[PDB]
């Protein structure tokens, strides 16, 4: 299954992130600044089914249940958003899909003078499905990713050529909480 293990901090507050055995993980955070602790693959695809289950997904504030990834060429941060803590994240509406059981909002954002993994002050634009309601967590659950590009790509929302990493993450900002996912 899984082959990468990704964790990272800006270094506000705490995030304790346990590399579990195979595609198990954990993290228990507190008073966060910008995070994504997760595990999947050193390349992503745009046709990779994701599984997993989330054993734990207990947040607050801003953490986000989701597939994450990037792209290159050009630098997109991309988000498929399953379940939330106390805030929905949006942005610029542009329209729906409709994957594995659920409905998802699909929104642009662009973030400004901010960490990627081309420097630490980058610009660059994130794409986002974010179900409608949260998805129920504890079984075992799919996200056909392929679905979503399609969609995104129906809007314009393109992704780059050169593939970077892809998790099945826990993500946050201004968050505490824990998590234990298991991804394959
Ligand atoms: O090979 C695949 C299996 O790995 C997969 O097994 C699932 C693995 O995750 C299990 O859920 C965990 C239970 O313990 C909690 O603490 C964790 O947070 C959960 O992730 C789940 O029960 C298994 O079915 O099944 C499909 C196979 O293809
Ligand atoms: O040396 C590079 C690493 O430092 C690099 O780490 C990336 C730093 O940017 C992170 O993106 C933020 C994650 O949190 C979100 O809320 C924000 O939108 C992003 O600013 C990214 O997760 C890290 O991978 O990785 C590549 C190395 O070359």
Same mark, same amino acid.
């Given at each position: 299954s899984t082959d990468y293990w990704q964790n990272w901090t800006d270094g506000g507050g705490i995030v304790n992130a346990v590399n579990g055995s195979g595609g198990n993980y954990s993290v228990n955070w507190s008073n966060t600044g910008n995070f994504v602790v997760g595990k999947g693959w050193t390349t992503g695809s745009p046709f990779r089914t994701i599984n997993y289950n989330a054993g734990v997904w207990a947040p607050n504030g801003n953490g986000y249940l989701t597939l994450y990834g990037w792209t290159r060429s050009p630098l997109i941060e991309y988000y498929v958003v399953d379940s939330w803590g106390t805030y929905r994240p949006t942005g610029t509406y542009k329209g729906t899909v409709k994957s594995d059981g659920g409905t998802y909002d699909i929104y642009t954002t662009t973030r400004y003078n901010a960490p990627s993994?081309? +420097?630490?002050?980058? &610009?660059? @634009?994130?794409?986002?499905? *974010?179900?409608?309601?949260?998805?129920?967590? +504890?079984?075992?659950? &799919?996200? @056909?990713?392929?679905?979503? *590009?399609?969609?995104?790509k129906s809007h314009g929302m393109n992704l780059g050529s050169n593939w970077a990493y892809q998790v099945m993450a826990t993500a946050g900002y201004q968050s505490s909480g824990s998590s234990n996912v298991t991804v394959w």
């Open positions: 993994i081309d +420097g630490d002050r980058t &610009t660059f @634009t994130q794409y986002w499905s *974010v179900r409608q309601s949260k998805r129920p967590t +504890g079984s075992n659950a &799919t996200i @056909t990713f392929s679905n979503h *590009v399609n969609a995104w």
